[PDB]
């Protein structure tokens, strides 16, 4: 989604507006997003909180995870560099139709 926002920003005259950021920032409170993902037949509810520093706090059931990462390109393949609860890993990311493919 952030990459799509940057792509749209490229073609706009107001190139540097703070609205073009993907910070998800609010005044005096923190934005928490309710996302749903399906693993097999199971629906997983993820509560994502946009932190000021740019990281994300994700809660799945009773467990909380501190997530931070970015997208980089090697050749023609997009790679996701992420760290979950201090554990760093790299994987190839492909999003086709409604399926997210993570190759590690």
């Amino acid at each position: 989604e952030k990459a799509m926002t940057d792509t749209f920003t490229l073609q706009a005259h107001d190139q540097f507006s703070p609205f073009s950021s993907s910070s998800g920032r609010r005044l005096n409170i923190s934005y928490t997003r309710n996302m749903t993902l399906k693993d097999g037949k199971n629906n997983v509810a993820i509560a994502v909180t946009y932190n000021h520093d740019g990281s994300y706090s994700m809660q799945i059931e009773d467990k909380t995870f501190q997530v931070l990462g970015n997208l980089y390109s090697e050749g023609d393949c997009t790679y996701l560099k992420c760290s979950v609860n201090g554990v760093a890993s790299k994987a190839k990311l492909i999003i086709l139709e409604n399926t997210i493919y993570l190759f590690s």
Partner: protein, 526 residues
């Protein structure tokens, strides 16, 4: 050629200094107090009301906004504290309405959503004022208006303050009609019951969206918001299955507005300030009697802490200069002491410069108490202060005002107070606003009484004077508190100083949606 090296503002504060330690501690407590109060307001009506709201299949009002705006985009909420302790025994979190500016389909829009969990969405007198303020902001900046309508009608016990007058509920429809005539899109989404007199809001809109089962529009399902309203009556332009579907439809409607933003001002790449923003806590503090250099505040909000001061050594109690915030050009006017004749003249000259070049203006209000100077032949100030009041009023460039300190008397008017239609007005948690400072008022009261007592010959004892003075001081403190002022809509919100740069950047970006007009001045009384 933009390769010239230039000087930068700001200095490193003495973190070890006791004054800095005390100022940081006091300001931090105010910010923490502000944060936790907003958290409570975030909950609206309460758990029972929220549970009932969700039980009907409807989204919570703030979740609706989250889904409406672009993913991850910031949302500038306005007047979060409207109705805070305004009514004696009734709690009305946020006034029963949520207003703010967010990006929908890449377009900045004004979003006005009723909070059905608060008193069933009834319109209190402050609720009308908050909505009218939002409409005024949208019109002045040409921002499309999106109404997430879920309301219970006017609050009958206070009807006299809602229905009749020009700035009462009737003005809401007048604003919709005027904006429509100017091609400022009006979009209404009926996501809940529309009561008597609220049925007009869907009808007065250019395009309208109604939810299948929840929505009802009638001047319940059979009478209005029926498939009758969608098909037989034709009041509905789009038919939505649920709240999520309606929000998806709204995004499509905005994408078809055939609007593209155009900038009238020159743009330069953005740069962060050279000093941390949180240092403003130590620099400013919470004691209005102490003074600080406004340049320090400027150095921590402008791009690269670069500032070109105008008439630096003339009328030094006022600071004026050119800078840039997020790439936009801005002319900054800030108080650095008591206003003098030279300061007023210097300000009047500066405002003409900005209007000529079509440069947005930012005002930083911090007016000083009269404890230092009883009169100082203020008659001289009157002749010149008006020249600034008159230039500021006629200026047509976008104007934003930030009260970082006191705001008293005619100094408020000269620095673009609420009465002078700044595009936005914000206040820091440490500000105070009144006709005069509290102490001065007491002295004035004391003199009148002592002298009148003298005519009687009755002795006004020292104790008598103190007794008279104490209530007055208390009233002034209570009524100048930032919360009192924000509870009523006198400002657009109380903001954390660390957030000053971000709020200004969002506000100026929204204000640039409208073309800048030529400024016509009145007679300058030389």
């Amino acid at each position: 050629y933009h390769g010239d090296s230039v000087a930068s503002l700001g200095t490193q504060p003495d973190l070890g200094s006791a004054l800095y330690q005390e100022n940081y501690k006091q300001m931090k407590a105010l910010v923490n107090q502000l944060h936790e109060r907003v958290e409570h307001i975030k909950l609206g009506g309460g758990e029972k009301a929220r549970a009932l709201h969700i039980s009907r299949g409807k989204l919570l009002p703030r979740e609706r906004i989250d889904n409406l705006i672009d993913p991850g985009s910031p949302f500038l909420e306005l007047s979060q504290f409207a109705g805070y302790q305004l009514y004696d025994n009734e709690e009305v979190p946020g006034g029963g309405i949520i207003t703010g500016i967010g990006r929908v389909s890449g377009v900045e829009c004004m979003i006005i959503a009723n909070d059905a969990t608060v008193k069933g969405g009834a319109y209190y007198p402050v609720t009308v004022k908050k909505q009218l303020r939002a409409q005024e902001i949208a019109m002045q900046n040409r921002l499309p208006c999106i109404y997430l309508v879920d309301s219970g009608g006017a609050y009958l016990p206070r009807q006299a303050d809602v229905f009749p007058d020009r700035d009462h509920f009737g003005r809401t429809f007048y604003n919709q009609a005027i904006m429509s005539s100017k091609n400022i899109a009006q979009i209404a989404v009926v996501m809940g019951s529309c009561t008597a007199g609220g049925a007009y809001v869907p009808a007065m809109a250019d395009e309208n969206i109604i939810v299948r089962k929840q929505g009802t529009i009638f001047l319940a399902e059979d009478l209005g918001g029926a498939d009758l309203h969608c098909r037989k009556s034709g009041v509905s332009d789009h038919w939505a299955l649920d709240d999520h579907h309606a929000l998806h439809l709204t995004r499509k409607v905005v994408r078809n507005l055939n609007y593209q933003k155009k900038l009238d001002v020159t743009i330069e790449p953005s740069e962060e300030p050279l000093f941390p923003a949180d240092e403003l806590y130590g620099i400013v503090g919470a004691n209005l009697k102490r003074s600080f250099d406004v340049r320090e505040v400027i150095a921590r909000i402008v791009d690269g802490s670069r500032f070109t001061e105008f008439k630096a050594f003339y009328g030094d109690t006022l600071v004026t200069g050119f800078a840039r915030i997020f790439g936009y050009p801005v002319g900054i006017v800030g108080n650095n002491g008591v206003l003098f004749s030279e300061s007023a003249k210097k300000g009047t000259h500066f405002v003409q410069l900005c209007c000529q070049r079509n440069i947005p203006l930012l005002f930083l209000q911090n007016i000083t108490g009269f404890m230092v100077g009883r009169e100082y032949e203020a008659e001289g100030i009157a002749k010149d202060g008006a020249k600034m009041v008159a230039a500021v009023a006629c200026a047509q460039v976008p104007k934003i005002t930030l009260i970082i300190g006191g705001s008293y008397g005619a100094g408020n008017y000269g620095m673009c107070g609420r009465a002078y239609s700044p595009r936005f007005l914000y206040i820091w948690p440490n500000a105070r606003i009144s006709v005069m400072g509290g102490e001065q008022a007491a002295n004035v009261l004391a003199t009148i009484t002592k002298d009148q007592r003298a005519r009687e010959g009755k002795q006004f004892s020292s104790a008598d004077e103190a007794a008279l003075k104490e209530p007055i001081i208390k009233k002034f403190e209570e009524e100048g508190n930032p919360y009192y002022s924000s509870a009523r809509v006198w400002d657009d919100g109380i903001i954390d100083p660390a957030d000053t740069r971000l709020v200004l950047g969002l506000s100026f970006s929204a204000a640039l949606n409208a073309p800048i007009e030529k400024t016509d001045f009145g007679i300058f009384r030389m």
